Amino acid sequence: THRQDINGKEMKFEVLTLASLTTEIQINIEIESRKSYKKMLKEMGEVAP
Amino acid sequence: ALSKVKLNDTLNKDQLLSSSKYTIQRSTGDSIDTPNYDVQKHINKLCGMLLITEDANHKFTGLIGMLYAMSRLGREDTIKILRDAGYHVKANGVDVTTHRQDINGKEMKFEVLTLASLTTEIQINIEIESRKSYKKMLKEMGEVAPEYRHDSPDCGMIILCIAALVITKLAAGDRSGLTAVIRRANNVLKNEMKRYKGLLPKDIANSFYEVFEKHPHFIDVFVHFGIAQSSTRGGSRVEGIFAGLFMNAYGAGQVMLRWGVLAKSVKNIMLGHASVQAEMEQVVEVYEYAQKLGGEAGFYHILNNPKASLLSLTQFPHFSSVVLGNAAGLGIMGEYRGTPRNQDLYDAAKAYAEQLKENGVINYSVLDLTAEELEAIK
Amino acid sequence: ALSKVKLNDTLNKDQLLSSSKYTIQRSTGDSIDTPNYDVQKHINKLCGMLLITEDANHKFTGLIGMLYAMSRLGREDTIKILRDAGYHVKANGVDVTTHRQDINGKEMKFEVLTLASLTTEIQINIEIESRKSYKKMLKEMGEVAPEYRHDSPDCGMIILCIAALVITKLAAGDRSGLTAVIRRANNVLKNEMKRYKGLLPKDIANSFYEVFEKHPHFIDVFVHFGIAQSSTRGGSRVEGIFAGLFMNAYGAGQVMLRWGVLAKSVKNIMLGHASVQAEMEQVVEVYEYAQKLGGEAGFYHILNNPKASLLSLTQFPHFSSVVLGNAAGLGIMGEYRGTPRNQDLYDAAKAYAEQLKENGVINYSVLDLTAEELEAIK
């Protein structure tokens, strides 16, 4: 578990300990996914499985 | 035969408790973070950074000290201790992880441990305060030494020396021996206190009092760690100090047995009183029980062992009164706040004990003097 | 029975410490360079080049001396010692390597050892200074001998003799016995000091003090090396000197036990005093504990063994005062800076001990004189 302050807010991030893939990269992947998810949710209302 | 009218109550209670064929086993609560030998250097580093920090926040010093003790015991011995004490433990593996964050607008790398008890932010803060204090000290004296650093391999064991003092005073039942802990931690470990600015005996002692009050299984783990530490073949000077302070806790909560042995040794006359002689059979039963228990009985009152009550002598008011009076007369009872409940026997024993010191005659029979020309030398 | 009111505290504490079913095991820190029999000649050569160098840099003499001790023990015995002492050790194999560099604008070949503790440049510098001193001495006397060279097979054991003296004085707790070490190293090893110009007892002794302070596991390794060295069937004269100086450390930190035995032997009268007789039961318990421990107990205070505190007699102020007074009267206490805490018993014992030497009568009963015509010879 990694906590850091993006957008001036404390949020918790769940990552894996990989020598090949750094923690910052996993955090960035999750952040971009969250942005895209919220944009899609705004543009269609409700998400599905 | 009237001499056969006897009940061996102490031995019978011990036999009842030691032949139980059913066992309870308790739940510790949260998961226990059990470090192994791997993170011992990191925990010792954390202790060193706590020690070099003036005005250190010692809220977690007891927790870190117990982590250090558990890492020197190892995961397997710690887990086995917790099973043998009769506890359900969910062991947590402790491993080292790297955390990067931006303080002062700069990217810097931090090396922490995965502990459920001690959060990552707390470890980072400990390291940051240690760094500030280190740079301030470096500025104020020019160059640091192995004496003033977190890398010293005894930084954890100084904290465990404070813990050993707290263990010596745990039998009082509360934080009443805190002043004694602070005094003895100033006498002992004075060079260390000059060395480390964050070594505050009161703060560390309060932290250890708190951790022992919250988690009574940490008392068990620490006592068995201190027995394993004192069972080594040797060590450094700080480890020797710890062993000496941890053997200071042996017999804690059982001062009246030692004072009764002392009252017998100085041959106090009030032990020949009729009521004391009435109680002698059972007091002797108690002493035989103690010497049958042996070494394990020295930590019964620290550990809150149930069989601690069987070592009590207060169920013998006249013998206890004579023992307390002898201690008071010899000037060793100090501020012991156990009270005699036979005032007359107490006063008589105190008077005789005071008379003992003033008087005193050499007993030449205990030597092997074949010819005694000492009479002419007088 | 009042005689049954006894607590065998010393034996009970020993039983507690010797029956521990959990063990700690510590981390030595950096990797330990463990040489084997292969590099023993090279380490002895290094010691010889250190010895033949006037104004030698003895900063690493303690480290090299411990390397020599470890190479005579071997890799397997050294590693087993470190496990038995309860240490995590990362053993480093030590092997010989060749290094060529250009000093004085010339290509010359240098033979060094791969040690993490001792860098290659340091070994090269040691050899260079040794070469300069050797050529200067050769110029000033014409021809060298086996006496004046690094090839002597006792060059390492002279350094270990200095180490043995430091071990004898380690129980004082600091570098306070340095003057005694220097004095005894001038008395003993005087021919060697005439032989080797780089044999500076103060510098070597300070180096060994420093290495023992830094690495408390080197004290363990050295004590067990000295026991293994004294367990041989024979050796050279320097090895005999080392064995004699290493048995000088037996019982260090326990002088009061020996002085109590001496006070009993000279039949000091103050041992019959009432308070001493009160303490006799427990002091006898301590003596039985010491003689039950046997030979291993002679190095408890050097090694910082935790059970060293159980051998103390200072918990018996009256007996200790009589013992110190007897020593003071017999004129052996010297500059011992342990203080009596019963002044009157100390003074009385001192007075009687002084009276002992002046007086003295032959006890004819200890012989087998059937007919005593000695009366007529008077």
UniProtKB/Swiss-Prot annotation, chains B, C:
The entry's stated outcome for residue 68 to F is: Increased transcription and 50% loss of replication
Which is an annotated GO molecular function term of this record? protein serine/threonine kinase inhibitor activity
Outcome of swapping residue 22 to D/F: 65% loss of transcription but no effect on replication
Ordered alphabetically, the record's keywords are: Capsid protein, Helical capsid protein, Host cytoplasm, Host-virus interaction, Inhibition of host innate immune response by virus, Inhibition of host interferon signaling pathway by virus, Inhibition of host MAVS by virus, Inhibition of host MDA5 by virus, Inhibition of host NF-kappa-B by virus, Inhibition of host PKR by virus, Inhibition of host RLR pathway by virus, Interferon antiviral system evasion, Phosphoprotein, Ribonucleoprotein, RNA-binding, Viral immunoevasion, Viral nucleoprotein, Virion
What does its PTM field state? Tyrosine phosphorylation modulates viral transcription and replication.
Q: Which Pfam families match?
A: Pneumo_ncap (PF03246)
Primary location class:
virion
**Cellular component, GO, one term:** helical viral capsid
- Does Lipid biosynthesis show up as a keyword for this record? no
BP term (GO), one = symbiont-mediated suppression of host NF-kappaB cascade
Report the residues modified as Phosphotyrosine: 37
For region Interaction with the phosphoprotein, the annotated ranges are 30-251, 243-289, 337-363
List localization entries: Virion; Host cytoplasm
What InterPro entries does the entry give? Pneumo_ncap (IPR004930)
What is this protein's function per UniProt?
A: Encapsidates the viral RNA genome by forming a left-handed helical nucleocapsid that protects the RNA from nucleases. RNA replication depends on the availability of soluble nucleoprotein. The encapsidated genomic RNA is termed the NC and serves as template for transcription and replication. Together with the phosphoprotein, sequesters host NF-kappa-B in inclusion bodies (IBs) thereby inhibiting this host defense pathway. May also act as a modulator of the innate immune response by sequestration of host IFIH1/MDA5 and MAVS into IBs.
Protein family per UniProt: Belongs to the paramyxoviruses nucleocapsid family.
Subunit architecture? Homomultimerizes to form the nucleocapsid. Binds to viral genomic RNA. Interacts (via N-terminus) with the phosphoprotein P (via C-terminus); the phosphorylated phosphoprotein P binds to N-RNA complex. When in a monomeric RNA-free form, interacts with the phosphoprotein (via N-terminus). Interacts with protein M2-1; this interaction allows the association of nucleocapsid with the matrix protein. Interacts with host EIF2AK2/PKR; this interaction inhibits EIF2AK2 phosphorylation of EIF2S1 and blocks EIF2AK2-mediated translation shutoff.
- Protein name, as recorded: Nucleoprotein
* Organism listed in the record: Human respiratory syncytial virus A (strain A2)
